[PDB]
Ligand binder design. Sequence first.
Ligand SMILES: CC(/C=C/C=C(C)/C=C/[C@@]12O[C@]1(C)C[C@@H](O)CC2(C)C)=C\C=C\C=C(C)\C=C\C=C(C)\C=C\[C@@]12O[C@]1(C)C[C@@H](O)CC2(C)C
Ligand SMILES: C[As](C)(=O)[O-]
Ligand SMILES: C[As](C)(=O)[O-]
Lengths: 64, 211, 163, 41, 211
Amino acid sequence: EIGPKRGSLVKVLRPESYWYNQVGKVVSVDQSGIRYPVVVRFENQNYAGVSTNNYALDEIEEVK
Amino acid sequence: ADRPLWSPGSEPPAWLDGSLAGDYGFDPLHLSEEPEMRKWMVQAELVHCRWAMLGVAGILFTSIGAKAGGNFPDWYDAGKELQKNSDIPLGSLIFTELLLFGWVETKRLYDLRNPGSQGDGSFLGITDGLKGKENGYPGGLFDPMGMSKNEASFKEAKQKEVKNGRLAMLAFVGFIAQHHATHKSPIDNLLDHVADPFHVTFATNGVSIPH
Amino acid sequence: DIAGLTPCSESKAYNKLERKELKVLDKRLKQYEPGSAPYLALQATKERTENRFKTYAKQGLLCGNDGLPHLISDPGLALRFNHAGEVFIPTFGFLYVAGYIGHVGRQYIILSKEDAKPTDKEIILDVPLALKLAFQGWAWPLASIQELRNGSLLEKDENITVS
Amino acid sequence: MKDFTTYLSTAPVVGLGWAIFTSGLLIEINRFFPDPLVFSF
Amino acid sequence: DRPLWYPGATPPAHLDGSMLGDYGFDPLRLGTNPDRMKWFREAELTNGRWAMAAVVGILFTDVFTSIGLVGLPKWWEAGAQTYPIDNQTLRTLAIIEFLLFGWVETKRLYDLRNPGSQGDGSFLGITDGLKGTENGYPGGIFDPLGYSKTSPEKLDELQNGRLAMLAFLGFASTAAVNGQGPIESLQTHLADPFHVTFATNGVSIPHFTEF
Ligand SMILES: CC(/C=C/C=C(C)/C=C/[C@@]12O[C@]1(C)C[C@@H](O)CC2(C)C)=C\C=C\C=C(C)\C=C\C=C(C)\C=C\[C@@]12O[C@]1(C)C[C@@H](O)CC2(C)C
Ligand SMILES: C[As](C)(=O)[O-]
Ligand SMILES: C[As](C)(=O)[O-]
């Protein structure tokens, strides 16, 4: 009810994030209330090998 | 426990039981295991047989003609002396052969990928004929004699062409092996062996003789 | 006459080099009988060496003060003369082959981005797909220009940057 | 047979089949056509 | 769709739509995008229409030359005979060609871009007739022979244009390795059909026919 529908893919706009401008599905937008509610999941690894991350709702945007 | 096998007692392969003609459960390299490779290899063996039989028949008939007195070369080095004094150049003969064979081998090919694809009537309006009755056994036009319109006779008549073709292509390897040793005609190797069995192989170069 | 170079038949150094090579070959060719294998090998080598030196001097290729051939690479000097084959058409042949290769590889790597775990397809290739695309790229100049006018090759700035 | 054909998509295949095709083609072109250094025209 | 190029089991993807001379032949999938297909259609039209009016100059003019009625030169040197002529409009030919073409090629270009788009007062009083019914099929050009219901005679035009493009390609490939003209090659090939063949001229392998 707060973030995008779960299962809907969205992109990232965190300027300092490995995943930037590319799309990734949302695991679960945290409804309990927190500054980084949207947990996005990516298939390709990063330099550290992590697949998921949580971002703020003022950063993510719509689909391509 | 239902058909004779090649090795008595061995377990036949699970991808071929009795549907193919000449089936004996002989496949140790797991070839033709998938349905598509088997559909390919069946017709490959069939065409091998249908060429080996004609080749061996022509070779034996020309050899018998030569031994009886006809003006016939042997099967080897026969394309060399029939081309020296022929009106049709080499190359102009080869590409005529290939041009006539491409058009028919292509129709033979695309009736394997989708049977009955050739019986739509685009070639001279031929519709009933040129339709693949089975994997590698067409009919209608290639079977003028009604000798395949009965399964009881057909399943038994097709199971012997594969055997005759296997025997003929084993004989063709005999023609090659039986030339590099004696350099004589295949019928000559026969008469030199029935008249005197003592002139058997293992006597000229079959085994190494350093001693 | 271009660049002070002279056609390679009138080069005394070129013929002197050919004679030198032939003498160096024959001095050790005379070591073997005309029937043995090494002798035939040296005979064939001399054959295609003489063929080298004869076939080059046709349609014109400039040799300099050293007598060796010198490739002319400027379009315009290969034109107004007969040197368009030195390096002008080989350029287009390599461009054609390199296009072909890149086109096929790109269409492969694109058509694999749709299925699950494409990484596997990069260590375990799709041999039949690669063979199909290999026998469809010899019209790539046609497909490239019109796929460019199409726009299906420009990514609309949706990639990872840092600035 | 199936797992073998699947194995035949790795380094031991094209990368071997490829570059074997190419070495053979180039060697044959340089053998039948002995010493090219400029096009026909 | 008229008969298919492969008679058997070769499915077309985007050539099920109606179009002139469509036999479902597009192996390289070069006309998938409809706009590029719409362009390549006019490409065929302009190529075929141009090659037909060219092969006729090579075919119908050389048939009289072989019979001996006229002494015109062959096409592989008809271009060299011109400028040596006394009254020779020397090679200001190419550039005036380009100008005179360009002025019309641009009109056809912009008509393909904006179909049937010719301003009212743009061309003196003949603006009206310049509007074309369809792309590559203009009205004002053909005087008779277009007001029928069986307008799909364009099949004849396309098939003849393809045949004439093959004709000119064969002309250029023959007059390059056979050394003679098309009619002369045809007549020598009727004289002796087994020796004069592409196998003896064009392929490098059969030249080693050393018995
Ligand atoms: C040897 C042969 C087949 C051998 C097959 C083998 C070993 C397969 C073995 C296995 O696969 C199995 C079965 C099962 C697998 O699980 C395991 C392995 C072990 C892999 C066929 C030859 C087949 C050979 C054939 C068909 C030859 C045809 C010859 C012709 C047509 C001759 C024509 C001419 O004679 C004329 C008429 C005139 C002359 O002048 C010129 C010429 C050219 C000589
Ligand atoms: C008709 As177009 C896309 O080639 O300008
Ligand atoms: C290759 As030529 C006939 O143009 O000299």
